[PDB]
Coordinates of C-alpha atoms in Angstrom, one line a residue:
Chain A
X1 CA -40.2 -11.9 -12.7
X2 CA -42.2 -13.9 -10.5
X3 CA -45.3 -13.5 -12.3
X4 CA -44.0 -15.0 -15.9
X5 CA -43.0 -18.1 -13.8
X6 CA -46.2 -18.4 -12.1
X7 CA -47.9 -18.2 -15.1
X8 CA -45.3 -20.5 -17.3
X9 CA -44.6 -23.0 -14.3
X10 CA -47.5 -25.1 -12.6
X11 CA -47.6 -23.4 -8.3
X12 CA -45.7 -26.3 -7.1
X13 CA -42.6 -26.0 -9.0
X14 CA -42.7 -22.5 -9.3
X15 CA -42.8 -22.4 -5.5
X16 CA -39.7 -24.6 -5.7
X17 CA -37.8 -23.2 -8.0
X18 CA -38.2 -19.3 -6.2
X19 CA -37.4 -21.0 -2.8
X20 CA -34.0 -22.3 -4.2
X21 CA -33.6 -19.0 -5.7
X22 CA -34.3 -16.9 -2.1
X23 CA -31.5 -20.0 -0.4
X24 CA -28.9 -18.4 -2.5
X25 CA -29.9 -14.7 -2.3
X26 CA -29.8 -14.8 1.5
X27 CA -26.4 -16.4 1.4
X28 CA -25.1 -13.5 -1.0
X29 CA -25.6 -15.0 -4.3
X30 CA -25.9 -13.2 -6.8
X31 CA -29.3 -12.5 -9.1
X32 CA -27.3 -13.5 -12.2
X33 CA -25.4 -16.2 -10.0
X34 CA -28.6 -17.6 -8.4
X35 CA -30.7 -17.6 -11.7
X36 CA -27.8 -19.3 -13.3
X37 CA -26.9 -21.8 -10.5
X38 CA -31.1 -22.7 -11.2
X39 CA -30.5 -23.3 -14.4
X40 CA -27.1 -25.7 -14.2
X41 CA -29.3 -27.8 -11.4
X42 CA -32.4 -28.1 -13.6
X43 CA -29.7 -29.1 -17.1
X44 CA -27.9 -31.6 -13.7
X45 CA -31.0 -33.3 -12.6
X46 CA -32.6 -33.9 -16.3
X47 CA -29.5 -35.3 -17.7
X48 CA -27.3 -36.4 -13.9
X49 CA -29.3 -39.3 -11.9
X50 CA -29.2 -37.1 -8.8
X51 CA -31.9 -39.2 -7.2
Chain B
X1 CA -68.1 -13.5 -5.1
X2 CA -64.8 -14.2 -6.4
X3 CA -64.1 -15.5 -10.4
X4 CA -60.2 -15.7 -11.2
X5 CA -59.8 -18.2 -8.3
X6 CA -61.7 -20.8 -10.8
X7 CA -59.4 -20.4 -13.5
X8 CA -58.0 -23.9 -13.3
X9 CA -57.1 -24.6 -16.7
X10 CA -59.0 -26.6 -19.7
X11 CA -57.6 -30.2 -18.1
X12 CA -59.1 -32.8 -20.1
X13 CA -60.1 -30.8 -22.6
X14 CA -56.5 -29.7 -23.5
X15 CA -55.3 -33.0 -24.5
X16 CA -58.8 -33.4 -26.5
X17 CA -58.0 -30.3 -28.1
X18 CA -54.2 -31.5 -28.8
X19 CA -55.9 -34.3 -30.9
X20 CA -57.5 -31.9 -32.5
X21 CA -54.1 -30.0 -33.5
X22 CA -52.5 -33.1 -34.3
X23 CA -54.7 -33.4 -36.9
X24 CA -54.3 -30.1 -38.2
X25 CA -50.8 -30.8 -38.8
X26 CA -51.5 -34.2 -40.3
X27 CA -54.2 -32.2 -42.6
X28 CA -57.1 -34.7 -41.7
X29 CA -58.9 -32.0 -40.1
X30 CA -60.6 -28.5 -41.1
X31 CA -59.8 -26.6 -38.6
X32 CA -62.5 -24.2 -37.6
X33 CA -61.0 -21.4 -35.6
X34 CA -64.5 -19.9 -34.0
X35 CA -66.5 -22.9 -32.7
X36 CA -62.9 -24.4 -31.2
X37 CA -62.5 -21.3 -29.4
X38 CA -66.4 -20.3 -28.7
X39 CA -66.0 -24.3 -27.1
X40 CA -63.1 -23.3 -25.5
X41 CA -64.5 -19.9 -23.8
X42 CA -67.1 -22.1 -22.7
X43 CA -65.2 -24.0 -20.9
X44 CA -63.2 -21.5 -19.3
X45 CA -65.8 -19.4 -18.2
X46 CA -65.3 -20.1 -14.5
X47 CA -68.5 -21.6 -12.6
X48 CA -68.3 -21.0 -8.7
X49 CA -70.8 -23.9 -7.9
X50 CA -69.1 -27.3 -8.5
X51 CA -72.4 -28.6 -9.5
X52 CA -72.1 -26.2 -12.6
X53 CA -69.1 -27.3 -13.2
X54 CA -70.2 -31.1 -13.4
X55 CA -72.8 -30.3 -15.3
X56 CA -71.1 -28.4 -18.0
X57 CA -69.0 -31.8 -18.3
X58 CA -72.0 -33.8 -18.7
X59 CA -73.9 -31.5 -21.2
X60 CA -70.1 -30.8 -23.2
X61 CA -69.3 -34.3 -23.3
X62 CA -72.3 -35.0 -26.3
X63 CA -71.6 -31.5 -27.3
X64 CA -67.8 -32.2 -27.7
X65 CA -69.0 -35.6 -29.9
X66 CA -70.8 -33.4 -32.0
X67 CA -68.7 -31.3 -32.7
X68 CA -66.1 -33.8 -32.9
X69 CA -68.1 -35.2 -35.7
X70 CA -68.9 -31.8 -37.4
X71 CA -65.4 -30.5 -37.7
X72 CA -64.0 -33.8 -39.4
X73 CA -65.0 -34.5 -43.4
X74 CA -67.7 -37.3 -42.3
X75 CA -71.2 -36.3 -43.4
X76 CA -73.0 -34.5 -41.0
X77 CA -75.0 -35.9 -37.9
X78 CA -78.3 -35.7 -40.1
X79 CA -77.1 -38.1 -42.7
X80 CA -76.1 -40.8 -40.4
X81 CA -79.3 -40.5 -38.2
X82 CA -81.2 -40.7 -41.2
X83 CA -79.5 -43.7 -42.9
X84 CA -78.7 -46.0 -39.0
X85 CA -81.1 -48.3 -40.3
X86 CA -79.3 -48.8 -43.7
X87 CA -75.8 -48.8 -41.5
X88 CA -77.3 -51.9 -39.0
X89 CA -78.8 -53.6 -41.7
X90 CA -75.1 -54.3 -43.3
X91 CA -73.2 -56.8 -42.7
X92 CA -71.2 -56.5 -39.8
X93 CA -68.1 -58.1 -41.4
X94 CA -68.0 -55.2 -44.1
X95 CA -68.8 -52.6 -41.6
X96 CA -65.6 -53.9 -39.6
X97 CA -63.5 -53.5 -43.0
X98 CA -65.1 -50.7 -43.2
X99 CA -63.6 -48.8 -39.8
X100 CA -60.2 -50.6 -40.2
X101 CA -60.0 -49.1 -43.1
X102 CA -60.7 -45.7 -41.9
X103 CA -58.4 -46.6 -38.8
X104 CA -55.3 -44.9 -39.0
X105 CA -52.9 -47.1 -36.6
X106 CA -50.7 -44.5 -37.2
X107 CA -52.9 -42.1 -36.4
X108 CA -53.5 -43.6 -32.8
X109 CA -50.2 -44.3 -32.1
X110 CA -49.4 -40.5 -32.5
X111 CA -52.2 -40.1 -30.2
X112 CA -51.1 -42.1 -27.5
X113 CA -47.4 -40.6 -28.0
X114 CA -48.7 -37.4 -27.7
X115 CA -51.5 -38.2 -24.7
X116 CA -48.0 -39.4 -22.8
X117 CA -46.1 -36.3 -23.6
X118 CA -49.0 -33.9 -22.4
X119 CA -49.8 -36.0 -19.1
X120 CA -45.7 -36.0 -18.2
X121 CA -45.8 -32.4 -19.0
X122 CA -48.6 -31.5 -16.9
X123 CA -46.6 -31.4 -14.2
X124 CA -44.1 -28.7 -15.3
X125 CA -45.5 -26.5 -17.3
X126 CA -48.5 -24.7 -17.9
X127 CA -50.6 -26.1 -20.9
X128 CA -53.6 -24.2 -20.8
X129 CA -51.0 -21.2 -21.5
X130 CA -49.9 -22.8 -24.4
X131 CA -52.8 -24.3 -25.8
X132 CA -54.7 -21.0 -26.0
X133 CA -51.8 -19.1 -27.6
X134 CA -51.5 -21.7 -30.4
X135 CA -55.1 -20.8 -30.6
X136 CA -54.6 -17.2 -30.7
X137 CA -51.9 -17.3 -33.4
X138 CA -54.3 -20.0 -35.7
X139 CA -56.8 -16.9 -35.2
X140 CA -54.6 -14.5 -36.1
X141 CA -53.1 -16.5 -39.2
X142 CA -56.6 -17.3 -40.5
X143 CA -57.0 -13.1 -40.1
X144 CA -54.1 -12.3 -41.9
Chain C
X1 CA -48.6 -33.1 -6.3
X2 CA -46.1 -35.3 -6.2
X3 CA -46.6 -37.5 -9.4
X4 CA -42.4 -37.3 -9.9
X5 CA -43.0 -40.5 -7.5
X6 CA -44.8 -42.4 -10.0
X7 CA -42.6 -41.6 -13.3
X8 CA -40.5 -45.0 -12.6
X9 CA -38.3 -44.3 -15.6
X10 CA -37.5 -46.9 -18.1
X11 CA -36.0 -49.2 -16.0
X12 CA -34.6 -52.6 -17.4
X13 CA -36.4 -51.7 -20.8
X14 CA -33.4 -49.2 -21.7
X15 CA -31.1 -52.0 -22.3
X16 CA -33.8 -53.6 -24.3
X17 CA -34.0 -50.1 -26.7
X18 CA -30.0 -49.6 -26.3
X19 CA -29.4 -53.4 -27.7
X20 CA -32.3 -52.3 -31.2
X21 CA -30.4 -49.1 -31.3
X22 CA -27.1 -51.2 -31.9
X23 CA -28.6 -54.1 -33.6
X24 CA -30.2 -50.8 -35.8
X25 CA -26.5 -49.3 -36.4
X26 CA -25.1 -52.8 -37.9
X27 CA -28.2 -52.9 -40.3
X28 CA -29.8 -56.3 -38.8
X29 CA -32.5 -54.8 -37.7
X30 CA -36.0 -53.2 -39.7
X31 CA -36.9 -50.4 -37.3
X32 CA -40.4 -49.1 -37.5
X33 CA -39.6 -46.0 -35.3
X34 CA -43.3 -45.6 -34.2
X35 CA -44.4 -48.4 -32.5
X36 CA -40.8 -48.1 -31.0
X37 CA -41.7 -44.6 -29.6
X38 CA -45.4 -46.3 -28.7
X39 CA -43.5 -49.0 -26.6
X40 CA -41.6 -46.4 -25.0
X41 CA -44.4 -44.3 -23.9
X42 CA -46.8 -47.2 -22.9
X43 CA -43.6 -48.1 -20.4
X44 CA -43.2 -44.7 -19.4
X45 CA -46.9 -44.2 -18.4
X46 CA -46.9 -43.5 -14.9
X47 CA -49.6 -45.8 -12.3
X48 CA -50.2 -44.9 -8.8
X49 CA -49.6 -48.5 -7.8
X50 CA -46.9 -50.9 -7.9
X51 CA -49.3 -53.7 -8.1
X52 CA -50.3 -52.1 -11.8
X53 CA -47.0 -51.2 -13.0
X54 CA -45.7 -54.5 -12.4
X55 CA -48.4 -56.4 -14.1
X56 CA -47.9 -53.8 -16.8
X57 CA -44.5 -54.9 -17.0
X58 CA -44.9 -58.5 -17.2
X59 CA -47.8 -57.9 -19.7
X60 CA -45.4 -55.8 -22.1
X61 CA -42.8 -58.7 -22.1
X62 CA -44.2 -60.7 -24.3
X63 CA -45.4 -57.2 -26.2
X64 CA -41.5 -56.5 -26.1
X65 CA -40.9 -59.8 -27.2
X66 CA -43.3 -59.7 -30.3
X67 CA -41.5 -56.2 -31.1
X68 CA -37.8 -57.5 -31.2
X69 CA -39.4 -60.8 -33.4
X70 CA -41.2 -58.3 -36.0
X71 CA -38.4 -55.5 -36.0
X72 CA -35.4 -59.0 -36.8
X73 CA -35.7 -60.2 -40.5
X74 CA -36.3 -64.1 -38.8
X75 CA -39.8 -65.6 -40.4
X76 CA -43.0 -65.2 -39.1
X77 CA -44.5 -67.9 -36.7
X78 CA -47.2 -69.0 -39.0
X79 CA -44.1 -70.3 -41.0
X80 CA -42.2 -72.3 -38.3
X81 CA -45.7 -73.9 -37.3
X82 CA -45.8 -74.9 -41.1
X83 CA -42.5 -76.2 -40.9
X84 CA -42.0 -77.7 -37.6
X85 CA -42.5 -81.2 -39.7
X86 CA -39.3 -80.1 -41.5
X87 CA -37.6 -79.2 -38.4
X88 CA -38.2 -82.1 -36.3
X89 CA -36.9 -84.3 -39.6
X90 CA -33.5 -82.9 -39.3
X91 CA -31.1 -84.6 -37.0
X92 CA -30.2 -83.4 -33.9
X93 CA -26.4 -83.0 -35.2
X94 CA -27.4 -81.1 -37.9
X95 CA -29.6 -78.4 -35.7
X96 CA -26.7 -78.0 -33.7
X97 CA -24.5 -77.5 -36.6
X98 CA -27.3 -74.9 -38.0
X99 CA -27.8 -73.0 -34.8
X100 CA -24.2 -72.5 -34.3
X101 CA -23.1 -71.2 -37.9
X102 CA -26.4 -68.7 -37.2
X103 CA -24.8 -67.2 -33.9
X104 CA -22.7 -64.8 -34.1
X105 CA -20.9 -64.9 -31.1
X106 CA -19.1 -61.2 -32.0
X107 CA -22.8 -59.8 -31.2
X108 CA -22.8 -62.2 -28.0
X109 CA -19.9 -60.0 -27.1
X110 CA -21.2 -56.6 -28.2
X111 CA -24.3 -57.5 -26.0
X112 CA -22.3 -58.3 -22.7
X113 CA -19.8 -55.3 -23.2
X114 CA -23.0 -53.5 -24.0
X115 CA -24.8 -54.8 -20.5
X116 CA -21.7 -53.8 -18.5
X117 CA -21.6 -50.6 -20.1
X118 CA -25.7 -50.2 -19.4
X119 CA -24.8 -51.5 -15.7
X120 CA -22.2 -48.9 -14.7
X121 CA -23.7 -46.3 -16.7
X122 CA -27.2 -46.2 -15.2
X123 CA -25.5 -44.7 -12.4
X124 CA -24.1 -41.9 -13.5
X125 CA -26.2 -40.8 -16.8
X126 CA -29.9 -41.1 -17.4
X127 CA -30.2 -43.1 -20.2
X128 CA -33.6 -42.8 -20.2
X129 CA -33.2 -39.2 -21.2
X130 CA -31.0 -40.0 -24.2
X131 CA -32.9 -43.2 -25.3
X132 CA -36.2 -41.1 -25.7
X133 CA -34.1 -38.2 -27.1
X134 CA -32.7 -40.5 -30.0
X135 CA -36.2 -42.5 -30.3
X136 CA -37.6 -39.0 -31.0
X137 CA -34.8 -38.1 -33.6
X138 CA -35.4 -41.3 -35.4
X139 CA -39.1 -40.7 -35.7
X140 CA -38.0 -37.0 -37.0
X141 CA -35.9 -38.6 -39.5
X142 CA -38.0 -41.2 -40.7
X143 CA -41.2 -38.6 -41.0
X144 CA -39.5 -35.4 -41.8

């Protein structure tokens, strides 16, 4: 819901994170896909130097 | 006019609070449920003019001593004010014993530990949210 | 905002922590997992200018420094300023002979391998991530 991660997740993030989320939904991802595609590029970028 | 859009979070206060909770834990405080959250509420209560806001800072910021002072084991405000003149006629080398003795480096270094951990997650996560329902459940605890 | 810009990671310092973690593993080391985690967090602090954080950094190596000389079982300075007369009585032959049985050139080795490892790794694994994670675990261990 997008109300537990605005209220969990600082705007900025949040706004992020549900942009990502809308790039794979309009390319026919999907929810569980997309949700769980967010979740392997948050666990990537923590632990994978990606920048 | 409008009140939710001043709902910005405690901020400062948070972390102040998080010394508080450390401690709790530690045991070197006793906790007081109703003045941390009557503070707390206070601070929250949204305040449209910034000048409000400013001087709620300024007024809390003696208040928070205070009751920084209260909430520990140390005598209260009272017995110090009454006995200053005792405290600056000591010697200052005791009196520097004195506070190392009741500095706990330990104590500090959790602090700072801790004042790193909450400023790197300020910028992922809500801590206000968190902070008020570690609140809620010390309320509920001391209920039950 | 963007304040991801100003959390510049550990940097050089993980090799530093990754050498006590080994030197920790062998048993040559007295770890006081606290001020470690202090260290850690006062260099992962973020500071809106480079200016700061490199003067921060050149202010911690010798804070670094004093850390790796208290954390290794070596004698404080106070006694190599006692016994500098001592020191300066000995040949220069025998110093030679005295530094050389002290090093321990299989650590020499464990370092370099240990640099290259640091070198190629840093590219492909945040070891910042895992030095803090074990930093924290230690400090878990040795409090709880």
């Amino acid at each position: 819901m997008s109300i537990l991660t605005r209220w969990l997740l600082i705007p900025p993030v949040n706004a992020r994170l549900i942009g990502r989320y809308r790039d794979y939904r309009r390319h026919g991802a999907s929810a569980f896909s997309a949700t769980l595609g967010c979740f392997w590029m948050i666990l990537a970028w923590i632990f994978i130097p990606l920048e | 006019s409008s009140l939710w859009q001043y709902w910005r979070g405690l901020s400062g206060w948070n972390f102040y609070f998080l010394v508080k909770f450390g401690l709790l834990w530690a045991g070197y405080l006793n906790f007081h449920p109703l003045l941390n959250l009557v503070f707390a509420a206070f601070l929250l209560m949204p305040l449209p003019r910034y000048s409000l806001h400013r001087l709620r800072h300024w007024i809390a910021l003696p208040i928070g001593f205070a009751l920084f002072w209260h909430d520990t084991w140390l005598p209260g405000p009272e017995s110090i004010m009454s006995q200053g003149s005792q405290v600056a006629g000591f010697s200052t080398d005791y009196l520097i014993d004195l506070v190392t003795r009741f500095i706990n480096w330990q104590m500090i270094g959790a602090i700072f530990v801790l004042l790193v951990a909450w400023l790197f997650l300020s910028q992922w996560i809500r801590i206000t949210v968190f902070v008020v329902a570690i609140l809620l459940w010390l309320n509920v605890l001391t209920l039950a």
